[PDB]
Design a protein around this ligand. Structure first.
Ligand SMILES: COc1ccc(-c2c(-c3ccc(O)cc3O)n[nH]c2C)cc1
Length: 207
């Protein structure tokens, strides 16, 4: 298990998301689905000139898996996934510069719902999750598990869990007062409100 410190600016971003009074938390789902859509666009584009890029799985889709017993909401995609290096380097985001631009915008009237315009929408997971686990598999690397409960550090380990072929799995260990995001009608509502034009099937699993 390797432990890393977040860059000062990323720890600042996470503290802002955790500590700012902001009721519109439901946008975390749109943000994570948007990242899933971007990763699926990436593998689809590569496959247009190289069909073997899909040897690790042809289906391009998103699964939403609530689990009331574990108090987890899992978002699975069959996108391009990430290398260990990209996972350590702020989960493939330009988080340092993105955070700076987002901070300036917040002082210029913007609100947390606009986080995605600054390329750091992944970190909106901390509006609803006390801990986030990211399992990822890229065609050019092994399967890795990234994890953080914020507090300035994250861990990276080789994943021993279920192999996923190719893509990214975001496991949201929800805060006790955020369990509405495990309810079928609530998830359906949010998907319809903010992710209705996503170009990949979104399957909402039942329990
Ligand atoms: C906007 O920046 C980014 C940065 C990285 C990605 C990304 C993800 C991913 C990352 C997070 C996630 O929730 C789901 C995913 O498939 N997987 N692979 C890539 C290249 C997507 C958007």
């Amino acid at each position: 298990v390797e432990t890393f410190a977040f860059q000062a600016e990323i720890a600042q971003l996470m503290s802002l998301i955790i500590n700012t009074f902001y009721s519109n938390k439901e946008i975390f789902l749109r943000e994570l689905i948007s990242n899933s859509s971007d990763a699926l666009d990436k593998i689809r584009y590569e496959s247009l000139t190289d069909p073997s890029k899909l040897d690790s799985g042809k289906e391009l889709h998103i699964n939403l898996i609530p689990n009331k017993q574990d108090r987890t909401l899992t978002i699975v995609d069959t996108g391009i996934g990430m290398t260990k290096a990209d996972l350590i380097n702020n989960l493939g985001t330009i988080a340092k510069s993105g955070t700076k631009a987002f901070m300036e915008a917040l002082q210029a009237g913007a609100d947390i719902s606009m986080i995605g315009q600054f390329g750091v929408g992944f970190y909106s997971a901390y509006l609803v999750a006390e801990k986030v686990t990211v399992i990822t598999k890229h065609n050019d690397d092994e399967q890795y598990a990234w994890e953080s409960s914020a507090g300035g550090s994250f861990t990276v380990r080789t994943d021993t869990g279920e192999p996923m072929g190719r893509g990214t799995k975001v496991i949201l260990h929800l805060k006790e007062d955020q369990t509405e995001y495990l309810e079928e009608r609530r998830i359906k509502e949010i998907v319809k409100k903010h992710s209705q034009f996503i170009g990949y099937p979104i399957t909402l699993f039942v329990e």
